[PDB]
């Protein structure tokens, strides 16, 4: 109808903004989501306000849309209405933060998406603000463990471990350690926080450098033979096993 | 195994030329830059230069511009030092080096009358 | 050039101590330090590379520690074959340099 006026949200979805107050004084607000349809009254008249629903299976559905139609807070809770099932927040530049609750409002596990599709799921999450973590790229994943200081992703290959870090404020740096004793086959490399780039040598040469960019992708670059100078172009790893093999 | 073996020890006199050898073994010449180090009693080790072993380009420490050359014969993995218009400031040992773990045995040359 | 600051020059021990030499760049320079021994008549040798692994062929025996631009060696349980010039390298570089070296005697 024409009496609501009607506004896209962070998602994909519309709220229709009763164009005038309702015979109570108020805005009356109604949204389409998981086919469901909720509704609520708000002081605003731009979209912003809280919707409610209820499911086929007596969740509470709970829409809290900010000031600023920047940003949707979608919760579900069990028929009580209060014990807290998941919470989404979504925000228009493409980014989100879903989290499944458990009981003592405890959050089980945790999903960040970033704007550009790439995610960081934190699972078996326990009180020392630990557990499981896993970066979900364009082409692979990489799977690893979280602190309450700092996300690290880790491959593995032979005697070699590589580690990316991703501290709380969200900096990336990069390690490499390997136990072979040899100098001939060592694995080693240095970090240049300033170019985002993991130089691997082998034996004092300079064997290529892996970028890790703000795009979240990482390349590789190979020396001439001797180290000396970067040849060809950087690449882009597409799968996880490339990861490996520049480890060899 | 890999091995650098470097040639036999030189008398020269003042104003001549030496060409000392290093013969690379075990591994693939062109993998690995070349190394020149200079040992003379009262000196430790002091880098002279190194060679780029695909392009042949080579780089020389500040002290060693002028009278040093660093060639090659990629072929033969044989890299050669050469110094002209030798002094008795020459008089040392010279080492190749290659990686961190190759090393020749050295070349003793004297400069004397 | 990086400077590599080697210390002490020369170091004088009883058998069965340990020894710990130092290096300290001009710069960082990134865990890219070796260790040679350097004994008479012969090329140097490999002890320790990337500040702390241990060369194959070597004993247990020869450690280092370090990050940054500062660095240390060590013999422990000292050997009377130990005797030897010692040298650190930095290899972070293209232009490779030396610590000034550090003669290791024997107290007796």
């Known amino acids: 109808e024409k009496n609501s006026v009607s506004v896209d949200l962070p998602g994909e979805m519309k709220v229709l903004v009763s164009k005038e107050k309702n015979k109570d004084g108020k805005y009356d607000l109604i949204a389409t989501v998981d086919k469901l349809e909720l509704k609520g009254t708000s002081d605003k008249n731009n979209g912003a306000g809280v919707l409610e629903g209820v499911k086929a299976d007596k969740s509470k559905v709970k829409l809290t849309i900010s000031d600023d139609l920047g940003q949707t807070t979608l919760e579900v809770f069990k028929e009580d209405g209060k014990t807290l099932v998941s919470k989404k927040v979504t925000s228009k530049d493409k980014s989100s933060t879903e989290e499944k609750f458990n009981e003592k409002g405890e959050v089980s596990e945790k999903i960040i998406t970033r704007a550009d599709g790439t995610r960081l799921e934190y699972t078996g999450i326990k009180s020392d603000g630990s557990g499981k973590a896993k970066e979900v790229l364009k082409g692979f994943i990489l799977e690893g463990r979280f602190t309450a200081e700092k996300t690290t992703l880790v491959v593995k290959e032979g005697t070699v471990t590589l580690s990316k870090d991703i501290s709380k404020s969200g900096e990336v740096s990069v390690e490499l350690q390997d136990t072979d004793s040899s100098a001939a086959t060592k694995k080693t490399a240095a970090w240049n926080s300033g170019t985002s780039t993991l130089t691997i040598t082998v034996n004092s040469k300079k064997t290529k450098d892996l970028v890790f960019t703000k795009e979240n992708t990482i390349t590789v670059q190979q020396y001439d033979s001797n180290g000396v100078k970067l040849e060809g172009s950087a690449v882009e790893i597409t799968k996880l096993d490339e990861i490996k093999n520049a480890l060899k | 195994q890999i091995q650098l073996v470097q040639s036999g020890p030189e008398l020269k006199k003042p104003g001549e030329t030496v060409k000392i050898s290093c013969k690379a073994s075990?591994?693939?010449?062109?993998?690995?830059?070349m190394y020149w180090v200079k040992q003379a009693p009262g000196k430790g080790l002091k880098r002279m230069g190194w060679i780029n072993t695909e392009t042949g380009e080579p780089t020389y420490a500040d002290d060693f511009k002028g009278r040093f050359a660093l060639s090659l014969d990629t072929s033969a993995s044989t890299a050669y030092l050469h110094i002209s218009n030798l002094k008795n400031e020459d008089t040392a040992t010279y080492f190749c080096?290659?990686?961190?773990?190759?090393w020749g045995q050295g070349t003793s040359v004297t400069v004397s009358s | 050039d990086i400077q590599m600051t080697q210390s002490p020059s020369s170091l004088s021990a009883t058998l069965g101590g340990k020894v710990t030499i130092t290096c300290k760049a001009s710069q960082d320079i990134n865990k890219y330090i070796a260790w040679y021994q350097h004994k008479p008549g012969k090329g140097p040798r490999l002890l320790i590379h990337?500040?702390?692994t241990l060369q194959p062929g070597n004993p247990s025996r020869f450690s280092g520690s370090g990050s940054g631009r500062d660095y240390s060696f060590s013999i422990s349980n000292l050997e009377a074959e130990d005797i030897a010039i010692y040298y650190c390298?930095?290899?972070?570089?293209?232009?490779?340099?030396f610590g000034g070296g550090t003669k290791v005697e024997i107290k007796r």
């Open positions: 990337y500040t702390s």
């Open positions: 390298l930095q290899y972070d570089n293209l232009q490779r340099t």
């Open positions: 080096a290659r990686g961190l773990d190759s």
């Open positions: 075990g591994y693939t010449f062109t993998d690995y830059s």
